[PDB]
Design a protein around this ligand. Structure first.
Ligand SMILES: COc1ccc(N2CCN(c3cccc(C)c3)CC2)nn1
Lengths: 40, 255, 236, 273, 236, 40, 59
């Protein structure tokens, strides 16, 4: 129950439960498959 | 017979071929794109010179020697004088751009050495004076020359200490930023595609640089016996999806 | 008027509680969000990116050189480096992994340790990396080392080798601050055959080493880091 | 969810553990690519590492102090701590600062909590009961000058009145000019040859003014204000390397000269355990 | 009795909170409303009505004359007036727009600047008005001025010209109190050809200038105005 | 939920969301169209 | 050159209207190809037809 009118006044947000490290761990242009050779 | 290894990038009226690549990085897995309306604020129609600004400019070459500490260029600064890209830059109030960066360094199968090529969004430098000394404008706008981390402290300039990234963080952790290594034994180029990253939809191109490109020797250059002890490093950079807005009189900037 | 009773704890301020508050700026409209590449949602997303380990810690002032593990041509049977696995201390401590682990009290999971070789292309080498699970001493010679988790690495076209320290443990969580009961083992590396340089070449070659966490990893019970402190408030 | 699958002996032409780090990727290698594993489940979600959780607890961001005393003959209230402002910022104290600067741009609502306690360091008959007023003087508003200016009427400016010893609490929406707060800024406010460098030129959210509403009693009373800040509804972009050296200034990245080696030197060899 | 816990902030008085209160006058019946022309609902409704700008600020005591921008017959190429666009200060500051903007911290949007000509009907003139977006200096000559937002105004039967300063900005809000990073440009005006008076006529002619906000406009984060203060309470 | 009986005791009103500047910006007797001449 | 050597050259075409470039900076602003000497021994640069008039004289 929100007792207040504005959105800033609500409690903390709830877990992204998004999670996708590939923008950070695999930003390569041509896809790399694990197990296939790195450099062909 | 496609290898990760050979590549061709054609952009505008200029083409680059590498026969010894190590894939290419696209920052944060996003490719440069123009500014959508839903994200727009300034009401001005923007100008998109296209092929006259989105081509490859090769900056002047550096020389890696056994004593090198590393070099640093800022964008869009490094290009402030390249062809029509630069003119547009000084003539509009606001502009926006992504880039393809291609760093080149070839040697032979007897050399060793490994450079880190990294792009740091919003690289705010530190004053070597400490306290709250600022880093004057000119010092953070070296132009095509870039900053040479093995040059001496100057007054009003930034600190040039490599184990600290010019800001109080350790060299070892720069790997959290989009980056690629050039290991003479593997690699001969590094290519990074940079999407436009800012907290505003479009900004000023002269009062704010939005990425520093940094090339840092990490495993020292080691040449074969009685080889000349140095290799040149060349940086070629191409603006991509550039847009300029708010045209007028032509900025005058310090120094 | 509805009858109430107040409980113990009334009026306390707990920095970790999460409740509603009146907005000081009623009706204000925040700036629209625009798109920015790079959004982070979990610290677990970022500790999977690998970063360099200053393994060569033997210097006396911080230098680019403590990231370089040296290799000597023609040595046989010998040991390249050694370290315990207290990820919250020692070599690990300044790495991004080490640096985040320190915001939490407990960790569990597998670690990924990789080595990238930087020697001339016409050289060759075979190294053995060994993980020694808790309970034995840091190995003293390869024979001892090779009886635990190990990978023979053959230096080739493919420049890096990724060793995993699989989670070997009785207790399902360990402390990030070094603790005995909770200790994780040792990591050592030895020549399997030996580094060989081509003609016209000389000196030391170096390995770069990285650390990142497997998708396996768990961190819990947040706390304050020993890695930062201060004596007076800063000002502008 | 499985944390590890079962995997047995391997003798392949398909080697997942050989890679080329020069590419910039961290290949997702697992224990089961290089040893024989058994199935195990995760039993865990990664709840407490969510950025909302990481930045979502109250941190002390500021300690100031004001006193209640006879202002008779004081030529400069501000200077007597009759009242005190706080050019608002979060860079002041280092604990929360290192946490935020793990990101480049951050966006979130703030829920401030203000604790005020009183001290009576010299002989008093009693402890008086003082009411503090905290008024947010955004940029472009009249700035107090005296501890009972027309300013403090604060007819258009949000102000809270609470008692010393108690706590005041109220949150404010994300009041950034841009789409997000910059944690770093490699720019200037204009192309001036001598204008400051860095964030400072963006941090311009005004200042918070504190004062006691009470007139003076016979003794003097020191009131020390602690402001706590909790981020709610957090959004963070572009992770960066953690802060290694100590901080010297609000808003610049500068570190102190002749600082000490931050990497612990081995007591022994590279070979040491 | 229902168990409760009180949170931090209990008992505080926040001048901006909005809650229910007991009525002191239970059951009282207010006077009926009758109809009155002119109801205002938003301050955004009124800042779109244009009001005069004391552009000719050069006097020494407030006078009707600082609303008049003078024009000289037969000058060529020259500059009629110049001003920066800090709507919360300087010429703008006493105008209704300026006066309301000052109740808020941030503004964004387009401005409408118009000039009404008052010279004899048998005279003629062509002026250029130029808006210079942030980043360049106030133009120093028409050549410089004409390369930015501009309108050639031809003085005719239609007495007023409405120039719009379109919102040109990186950041989506600017501060109403003058700030650099956040600055908006300059506005200048020059003879395009020149004012020409008919025979039997002489002297200066004047332009009146107005300012109002486009429907585009946004103002946010209310605060107190520097435009009014006091030293003792008033009495009857 | 109002806890009190009288209307004066309720909280602040809610946004007009009315907005019509024409009584102030265009109180002319004969309608003016933008683009058509002001004085015919 | 020997197979164990390496080199990177830039070839530049300068369309009519400017002088023969005097340094690479000047050269690199017109039609150009960075050539990386590798296994593939030849590089094919095209001088695309850049012209106002649709025919030129051979003399
Ligand atoms: C560097 O990042 C940030 C992040 C948040 C922040 N602000 C400071 C001002 N603050 C604020 C805003 C409104 C009212 C009051 C009392 C305080 C909100 C958070 N400042 N810098």
């Amino acid at each position: 129950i929100n007792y207040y009118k504005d959105a800033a006044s609500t409690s903390s947000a709830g877990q992204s439960l998004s999670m996708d490290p590939s923008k950070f761990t695999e930003p390569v242009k041509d896809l790399m498959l694990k197990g296939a050779p790195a450099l062909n | 017979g496609y290898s990760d290894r050979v590549q061709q990038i054609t952009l505008g009226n200029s083409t680059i071929t590498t026969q010894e690549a190590a894939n290419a990085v696209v920052c944060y897995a996003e490719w440069p794109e123009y500014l959508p309306d839903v994200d727009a604020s300034d009401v001005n129609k923007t100008s998109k010179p296209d092929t006259s600004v989105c081509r490859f400019y090769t900056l002047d070459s550096k020389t890696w020697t056994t004593g090198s500490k590393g070099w640093c260029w800022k964008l869009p600064d490094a290009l402030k004088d390249m062809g029509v890209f630069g003119q547009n830059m000084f003539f509009h109030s606001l502009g926006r751009s992504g880039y393809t960066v291609h760093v080149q360094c070839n040697a032979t199968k007897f050399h060793s050495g490994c450079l880190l090529v990294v792009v740091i969004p919003e690289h705010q430098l530190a004053s070597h004076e400490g306290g709250n000394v600022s880093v004057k404008y000119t010092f953070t706008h070296p132009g095509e020359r870039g900053i040479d981390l093995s040059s001496a402290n100057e007054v009003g300039g930034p600190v040039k200490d490599v184990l600290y990234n010019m800001n109080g963080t350790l060299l070892g952790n720069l790997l959290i930023f989009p980056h690629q290594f050039i290991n003479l034994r593997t690699n001969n180029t590094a290519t990074i595609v940079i999407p436009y990253i800012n907290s505003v939809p479009i900004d000023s191109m002269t009062r704010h640089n939005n990425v520093s490109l940094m090339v840092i020797p990490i495993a020292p250059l080691t040449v074969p016996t009685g080889a000349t002890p140095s290799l040149p490093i060349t940086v070629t950079i191409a603006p991509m999806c550039t847009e300029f807005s708010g045209i007028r009189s032509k900025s005058i900037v310090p120094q | 008027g509805l009858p109430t009773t107040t409980l113990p704890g009334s009026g306390q301020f707990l920095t970790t509680d999460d409740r509603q508050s009146p907005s000081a700026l009623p009706n204000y409209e925040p700036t629209p969000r625009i798109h920015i590449p790079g959004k982070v949602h979990n610290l677990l997303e970022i500790i999977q990116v690998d970063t360099l380990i200053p393994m060569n810690n033997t210097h006396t002032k911080d230098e680019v050189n403590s990231y370089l593990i040296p290799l000597n041509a023609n040595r046989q049977n010998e040991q390249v480096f050694g370290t315990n696995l207290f990820i919250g201390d020692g070599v690990f401590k300044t790495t991004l992994l080490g640096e985040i682990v320190q915001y939490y009290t407990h960790w569990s999971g597998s670690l990924r340790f990789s080595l990238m070789y930087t020697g001339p292309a016409l050289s060759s080498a075979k190294l053995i990396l060994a993980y020694t699970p808790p309970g034995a001493r840091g190995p003293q010679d390869r024979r001892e080392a090779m009886l635990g988790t190990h990978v023979v690495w053959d230096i080739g076209l493919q420049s890096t080798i990724v060793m995993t320290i699989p989670w070997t443990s009785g207790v399902q969580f360990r402390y990030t601050d070094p603790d005995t009961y909770t200790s994780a083992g040792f990591l050592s590396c030895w020549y399997q055959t030996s580094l060989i340089l081509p003609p016209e070449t000389t000196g030391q070659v170096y390995l770069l080493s990285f650390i990142s966490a497997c998708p396996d990893f768990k961190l819990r019970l947040m706390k304050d880091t020993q890695t930062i402190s201060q004596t007076v408030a800063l000002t502008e | 969810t499985v944390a590890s699958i079962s995997s047995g002996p391997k003798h392949t032409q398909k080697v997942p553990i050989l890679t080329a780090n020069e590419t910039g990727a961290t290949m997702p290698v697992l224990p089961s690519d290089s040893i024989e594993t058994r199935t195990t489940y995760m039993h865990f979600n990664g709840s407490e590492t969510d950025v909302e959780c990481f930045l979502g607890r109250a941190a002390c961001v500021h300690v100031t102090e004001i006193q209640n005393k006879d202002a008779t003959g004081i030529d400069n209230h501000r200077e007597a701590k009759l009242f005190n402002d706080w050019k608002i910022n979060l860079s002041s104290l280092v604990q929360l600062r290192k946490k935020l600067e793990l990101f480049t741009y951050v966006r979130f609502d703030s829920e401030y909590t203000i604790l005020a306690t009183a001290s009576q360091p010299d002989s008093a008959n009693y402890s008086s009961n003082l009411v503090v007023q905290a008024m947010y003087v955004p940029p472009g508003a009249p700035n107090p000058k005296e501890w009972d200016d027309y300013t403090w009427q604060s007819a258009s400016n949000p102000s809270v009145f609470f008692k010393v010893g108690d706590t005041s609490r109220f949150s404010v929406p994300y009041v950034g000019l841009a789409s997000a707060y910059n944690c770093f800024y490699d720019g200037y406010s204009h192309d001036d040859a001598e204008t400051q460098y860095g964030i400072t030129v963006l941090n311009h959210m005004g200042s918070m003014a504190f004062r006691i509403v009470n007139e003076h009693d016979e003794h003097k009373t020191l009131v020390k204000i602690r402001v706590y800040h909790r981020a709610k509804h957090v959004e963070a972009w572009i992770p960066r390397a953690p802060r290694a050296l100590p901080y010297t200034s609000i808003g610049r990245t500068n570190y102190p000269k002749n600082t000490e080696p931050v990497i612990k030197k081995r007591k022994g060899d590279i070979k040491s355990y």
